[PDB]
A paper describes a structure:
Sco [name] is a homolog of Mycobacteria tuberculosis (Mtb) GlgE. In Mtb, GlgE is part of a biosynthetic pathway that generates α-glucans from trehalose and is a genetically validated anti-TB target.
While compounds 11–13 did not inhibit Sco [name]-[name] at the concentrations evaluated, an X-ray crystal structure of the Sco [name]-[name]/13 complex was solved to a resolution of 2.73 Å. However, the cyclohexyl moiety of compound 13 exhibits only weak difference density suggesting a lack of sufficient binding interactions with the residues forming the Sco [name]-[name] +1 site. Inspection of the −1 subsite illustrates that the carbocycle C(3)-OH and C(7)-OH functional groups are in an axial conformational and form a bidentate hydrogen-bonded interaction with the side chain oxygen atoms of the Asp 394 nucleophile. Therefore, the 3.2 Å distant interaction between Glu 423 and the amine of 13 should be considered an ionic interaction. Unfortunately, the compound 13 carbocycle interactions with the Glu 423 (general acid/base) were weakened by addition of the cyclohexyl moiety due to steric hindrance.
Residue numbers in the entry:
A (entry chain B), B (entry chain A): 15 to 663
Write the structure that this text describes.
């Protein structure tokens, strides 16, 4: 009982944890299945990929090619359809027609064994014809058999008849396959399209108040949705919406002690008004939330709720479930840290005393918000909770509600970010904000779209309430434009935190990535109408970007991405493709200085010969340009951060 | 039911084919088991490797360490004992005592929480005490427990009682391990030492004849073994010893037609005088072979036989089992090709008509030679036979006779060479002869001793009857010296084909790696006594080298090898280590010109601080040197090809 089959087929990728967790995909996504495929001796091998939908049904005949000569690595692109658990195998086989055609091309003109090789071809095309099921496809192949056998013709003419394109036609359709060897099935999990594609917008409802009641409510915040929808966003992510604690409530600018009307951080979940299943009374009731969810849905927006599995000391859990916390010998509970940060206002959950209780409560809490229209959750700080916990929770929820998308806010070491993705988290936050040079971007994106894409889906938020990167601080408005062009086109999921559009870039101090006067500890009213009137918002650019994404399916995917070399360190170029769609992007990473460069396009990667002109259209400017293997660009920051171009039919 | 455990243990290496084939080792070989290990939050993890011999017995406590900061990859070295099928797991755990000690060294001198931190520690040394079952070890920790709780002692003095190395012992002996998580078992296959370590000598028995009878016999050839054993070799590899066919027998110098007395290629196995189970009658009988095998053993030599699963057209199989061959439509059998080489004198075995029959006969043939003392098989050209055939045959033979070593002569693409190693082949031929620059050699060895060492064991033949590399052609005798030093110290198994020691370097043509007047097609008599008197043999160095290997266990293993930088392309340097043994080698790859260089030793890789003296002894000259972090060397071709140095304590 051998491990290797008749024709070796080994290391079928994609693979997640040696095959005991599923590789990932979404409806309509293309990705490449691959395998090492070879045989003993010198004869030709073929390989093909077999996709199975969740019922057993196989996909189209999908043949593979050797991906680089002499490597015996083969690949083919396959595409997932209906959501569910799929499977895929690679089949390998002896390819006798390629083997024979190769030998007949040398032996027949050399006059070697011409009578034997031609009868070999007759017998073998006859065999190819026994499986071809079309009467026309059959009779075509069998004519070549007779032409091979016609001794009244020169051998060169008899052989020629087995290589006419009408024979390659019938043969490409129904190939003759010897010694068919299958790999073991590998699991694929196909999820709804939002798992991979979508633009996210984060805002605090409490900041969208009125002059007479400054603390916003769901009813006042619902009026901010039209602006957000108009910018072309699909998901609206809310920070925790529940009662905020008062004990050790932080004051403005992350000061330890609050004051009389300091609002405190929404992540300090819990107070005697309720816990994670309740609404913060200054936002309104559970019906105010439904109104919000409904108004969001009407505009085409999906609500994503923040799940922070933690408590403020006033959460009812603190006394209702003391065993969900770790108490020091004096009975106090150390406040949470994500060092060097201190979270004095909240308690970390301990998991080893009553793991069943936390599991049951977590899914109850989540099913509660599920019942009210929440189908997406931004999981706060998952890497401080056990990995097997999220695995079990995501399984419970998805076993009944497979459409529920979880996003992992895991800024941490590469191991944990990867593991959390592989155990269930549909999307992941990334290091995107700390990749700002051409080389950092190229490296990270080469990886995220490389092998990582079989278990991770990146959500490129260009800012969060906790990350005001120095690139944006020092670059001003042209920095905010470049980073949005970058996030919206390098990932099929990107996002911004409210105030990005207004280019809010004042840090708490220098060397800090915190915001001065951070929204986390204060209401942050913003004059959206003034900013729009005065043109001091890049909301126009954010909108056209999500427009480009919605008209260009190349931008709705991640794995098909290629960087093109340019002769300036500050100028990056790259293209993505989906079928006939080819988007092509050139960004000036200098926020401060005009750059000009030669972008030397890798023409075959766009599907073109080395010398062809390319009709492109700069979807930001609407202008049209004619490019070739080398192209002069000039990008003036403030005027034009980048060209975002579709190739024209 | 989750995939990930409480404390994650992930991607445990070494692994072969996702765990469906065993990793390899030999009795007494050291190698590193490694794993990705981490946890949620900021407390410490520990991990250990649990190696199990074939009855289950677990090995010594083997704790692991993070291999680089922030990588979450952990490793520990394990050592194999008895032959058999072993298994190994990694356990990971929360390390609460390491976390507390970390907090106690910071908080206690600052005077922060001293009464709580000290009580946290007492309660926890109390917990380590419930697992120590000895009456004495318990009170040891409990005295630290009582001193930690001692209200009337200085805080610095209470902490000290939990940190005495007298307590570090009883804890390293019985560690407090929380939430112990295991990986699933991985299989390890431990083979006898000769599979990894040993020197080979290949020669043709028929070339050791008498003046009156030029075709040697086993009885005359047995007389050549004293020279071979004395040269320090362990294995004697004989080309096929069976009847040679006459149909299409090749003549001298690989000419297509023989003459009246051309002996033919020994690989043209088979005639009506017998096939693979029979002895070539010009060699003597099966009793002469017994005599030869027995006389070889007396000298400390093991016989390795060539197994070539193929036939001359006069083999009895050609008519007894036509189905083991591939027939053209007229019933003839195309002669074997390995393009561009043509082997007109032999037919390849075809495997798809009667695979059980070929298997049964194959293991029948091998058990015959096993019955006559042959426990090693050099499998000729395995990559022209199906991979699964070798898997099933090697499993079968080793299933009854686990000591039988197979060596695969597969010079081909890397995929095939890897798979044959992974399916059973104890040793592999390598690309060694085509790696002659410092960068080629370093690249290849970094690969062979890196991850490849978990499934392949290299046999560094510096020449074969089929590979006289141009390096040896153009370099002459100093080239032959350099490659022997290189082969004998870079691999624990190396070999030479007889005539190497006489520096036979005359090729078929320019641009060929074939031998002129190949022993493959003609008796090649050699005046061994004359060459030694005339000093035209490098047998002294071969002998010196094999002695150095036998006194220095660093040269009897493969994986511990490290390259040291030198400032001349032509001077390579490296060291190997096995326990206290450190061999350090500096070779001049220039065969024609004296090279001088500064060898800049990587002192930690030798186990020293950058300022230490290193007493070495040049095992080739007997000279003694005091070396350091940087060393000037001068190597003259002809006089000194290399330093091969042992370190002294
Ligand atoms: O829940 C903690 C939490 C985790 C998130 N993780 C960071 C760490 C890596 C860099 C970027 C994200 C973010 O801090 C943010 O979502 C959140 O913190 C906020 O809430 C706390 C509770 O009130 C306050 O104590 C704290 O000051 C305030 O910032
Ligand atoms: O057995 C096949 C074969 C393969 C081995 N593989 C080589 C080829 C690639 C580069 C170096 C290793 C070696 O050639 C050698 O063992 C063998 O060849 C010999 O056997 C044939 C049958 O008698 C003769 O026709 C031929 O003249 C003679 O040389």
């Amino acid at each position: 009982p051998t491990v290797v089959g008749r024709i070796p087929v080994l290391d079928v990728r994609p693979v997640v944890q040696r095959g005991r967790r599923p590789a990932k995909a979404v409806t309509g996504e293309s990705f490449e299945v691959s395998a090492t495929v070879f045989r003993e001796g010198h004869d030709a091998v073929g390989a093909n990929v077999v996709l199975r939908d969740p019922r057993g049904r196989p996909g189209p005949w999908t043949p593979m090619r050797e991906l680089a000569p002499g490597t015996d690595r083969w690949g083919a692109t396959v595409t997932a359809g209906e959501t569910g658990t799929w499977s895929y195998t690679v089949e390998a086989w002896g390819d006798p027609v390629t083997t024979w055609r190769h030998h007949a091309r040398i032996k027949i003109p050399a006059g070697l064994d011409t009578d034997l090789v031609l009868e070999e071809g007759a017998r073998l095309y006859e065999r190819a014809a026994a499986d071809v099921p079309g009467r026309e496809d059959r009779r075509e192949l069998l004519a070549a058999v007779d032409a091979l056998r016609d001794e009244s013709r020169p051998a060169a003419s008899r052989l020629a008849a087995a290589l006419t394109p009408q024979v390659d036609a019938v043969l490409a359709r129904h190939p003759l396959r010897d010694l068919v060897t299958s790999s073991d099935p590998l699991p694929l999990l196909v999820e709804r399209e939002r798992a991979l594609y979508g633009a996210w917008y984060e805002f605090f409802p409490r900041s969208e108040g009125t002059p007479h009641t400054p603390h916003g409510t769901f009813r006042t915040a619902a009026r901010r949705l039209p602006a957000i929808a108009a910018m072309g966003f699909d998901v609206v992510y809310l920070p925790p919406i529940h009662p905020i604690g008062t004990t050790h409530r932080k004051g403005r600018n992350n000061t330890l002690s609050a004051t009389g009307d300091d609002v405190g951080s929404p992540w300090a979940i819990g107070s005697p008004e309720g816990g994670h299943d309740s609404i913060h009374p200054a936002l309104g009731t559970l019906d105010d939330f439904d109104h919000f969810v409904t108004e969001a849905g009407k505009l085409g927006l999906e609500i994503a709720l923040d799940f922070a599995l933690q408590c403020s000391p006033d959460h009812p859990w603190v006394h209702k479930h003391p065993e969900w916390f770790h108490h020091r010998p004096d009975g106090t509970i150390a406040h949470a840290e994500n060092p060097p940060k201190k979270y004095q206002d909240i308690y970390p959950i301990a998991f080893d005393a009553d793991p069943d209780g936390l599991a049951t409560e977590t899914v109850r809490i989540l099913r509660h918000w599920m019942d009210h229209g929440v189908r997406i959750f931004r999981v706060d700080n998952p890497h401080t909770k056990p990995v097997a916990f999220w695995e079990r929770v995501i399984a419970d929820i998805n076993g009944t509600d497979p459409d529920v998308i979880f996003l992992a806010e895991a800024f941490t070491r590469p191991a944990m970010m990867a593991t959390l993705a592989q155990i269930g988290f549909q999307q992941s936050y990334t290091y995107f904000t700390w990749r700002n040079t051409k080389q950092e971007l190229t490296e990270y994106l080469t990886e995220l779209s490389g092998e990582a894409a079989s278990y991770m889906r990146p959500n490129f938020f260009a800012n969060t309430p906790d990350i005001l990167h120095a690139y944006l601080q020092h670059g001003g408005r042209p920095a905010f434009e470049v980073r949005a062009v970058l996030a919206a086109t390098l990932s099929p999921t990107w996002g911004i935190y409210s105030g990005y559009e207004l280019c809010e870039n004042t840090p708490l101090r220098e060397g800090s990535e915190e915001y001065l006067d951070s929204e986390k500890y204060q209401l942050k009213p913003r004059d959206w109408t003034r900013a729009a009137r005065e043109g001091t918002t890049i909301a126009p650019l954010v909108t056209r970007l999500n427009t480009i994404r919605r008209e260009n399916p190349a931008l709705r995917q991640l794995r098909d991405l290629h960087f093109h070399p340019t002769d300036k360190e500050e100028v990056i170029a790259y293209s993505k493709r989906q079928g006939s769609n080819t988007v092509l992007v050139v960004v000036n990473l200098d926020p401060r200085h005009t750059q000009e460069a030669t972008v030397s396009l890798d023409m075959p990667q766009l599907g073109l010969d080395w010398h062809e002109s390319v009709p492109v259209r700069d979807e930001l400017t609407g202008e049209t340009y004619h490019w070739g293997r080398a192209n002069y660009v000039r990008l003036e920051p403030g005027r034009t951060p980048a060209h975002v171009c579709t190739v024209l039919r």
